[PDB]
Amino acid sequence: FLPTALLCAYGFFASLRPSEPFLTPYLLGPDKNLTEREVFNEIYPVWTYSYLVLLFPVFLATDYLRYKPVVLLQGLSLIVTWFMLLYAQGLLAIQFLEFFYGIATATEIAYYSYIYSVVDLGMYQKVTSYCRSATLVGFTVGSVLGQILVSVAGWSLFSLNVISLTCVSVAFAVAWFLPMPQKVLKVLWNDFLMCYSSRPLLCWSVWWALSTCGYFQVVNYTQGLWEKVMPSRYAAIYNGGVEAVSTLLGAVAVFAVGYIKISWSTWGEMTLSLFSLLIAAAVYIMDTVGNIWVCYASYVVFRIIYMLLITIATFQIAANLSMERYALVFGVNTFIALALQTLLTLIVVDASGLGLEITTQFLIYASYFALIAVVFLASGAVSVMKKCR
Ligand SMILES: Cc1ncc(C[n+]2csc(CCO)c2C)c(N)n1
Q: Which residues make up the annotated site Essential for pyridoxine transport?
């Protein structure tokens, strides 16, 4: 099991970033001296902009380069990201840092499609699940390591960032010896039309994309919300346990999603709408309680419900589509998700735009998930009217 074990070791090491938990307290700390206005209005949105603009060329280069060099591109981008996060001041350098984080994250689809051209067709699902679990274990291990090192050990965030850079460098070293994958546009667009030219073919797609949008745009500013509620100047912040338990219970929910004896056509959209309304309630609670432990708990509830929703949505999408287009659909829906996220980010987040405060944009995010709650309910009620006949 050497080729799969090496790949899962690479996933474990690349995903083992103990500093994503403890990021905003470092960025706004004495190490870089960046004000919350500056960070949350110009630094962070560049990640979304870069991820959007680079998802398309990454997707093209992945198939153009036979899926191998994109993994090393991800490793090198992570290495330079974690070096510049050790040594960069000002604003432009950190903006390019988030650009490099974007080019790193845009290649996750490439990393997960690398498996399809090196393994057997029958075992592809099981090895993909194994690698996803490897990434989850890596992130949980990094999260608990950072929490243990910053809570009782009293280790500064600079050394923790050094650990993050060491782990991503080890990931690059592992990736360098990965076995090579030895194994129209109008028509593809016409086939893309056929990807939604049916009753269930269109379904779950835009809701997967829009829920992914909400998740992506709330996870990173949730760090800022925790910083605002509990400042890091003279208080100990327990992020690592929370980013550990969130991923752990998300994996648990992913496992439990397949054990529910429920058919899609019966109440799938109704259950998704209920889950989305619960997500909106959790976001509003996290924004408005003013207590830190309960807002971490509501964040964990968000994580669990989002993982359940994504698992059911991607199960339905995979049932709708063929195995040869898994990467294509998972790329197109992520592309439109980042497009809508960037649109809303220029509307409410970007300093050149309206630049609304972080405590205010979460009121939109709660209403934003309340907005998808209504349309999913309305589309769910649309099937109910058809179910009447
Ligand atoms: C270096 C770096 N780390 C994380 C993010 C954004 N981000 C992605 S996932 C997640 C949750 C983990 O706490 C966060 C904050 C970034 N833009 N740059």
A: 74-75, 79, 81-82, 156, 161
Q: Are 346 and 284 members of one domain?
A: yes
Residues 197 and 286 in one domain: yes
Resolution, Å (one decimal) = 3.2
- Total residues found in the chain within this entry: 389
CA distance 99 to 356: 22
Q: How many independent structural domains does the chain possess? A: 2
Report the C-alpha gap between 272 and 276 in whole angstroms.
6
Tokens 């083992």 correspond to 16
Q: In angstroms, what is the span from residue 220 Cα to ligand 1's centroid?
A: 6
- Tracing tokens 């300093």 back to the chain, one arrives at 351
Whole-angstrom distance, CA of residue 265 vs CA of residue 319: 13
Question: CA 12, CA 134: separation in Å to the nearest integer?
Answer: 5
Tell which residue, 63, 12, 20, has the closest CA to residue 174: 12
Report d(CA 344, CA 334) in Å as an integer: 15
- Same domain for 146 and 269: no
Identify the domain containing residue 51 by its residue range: 1-183
Domain endpoint, select from 132, 152, 183? 183
How remote is the CA of residue 322 from the centroid of ligand 1, in Å?
Answer: 32
Which of 19, 20, 46, 47 is the pocket-test mutation for ligand 1 (most atoms within 8 Å of CB)? 20
User: Cα 41–42–44 angle (5° rounding)?
Assistant: 85
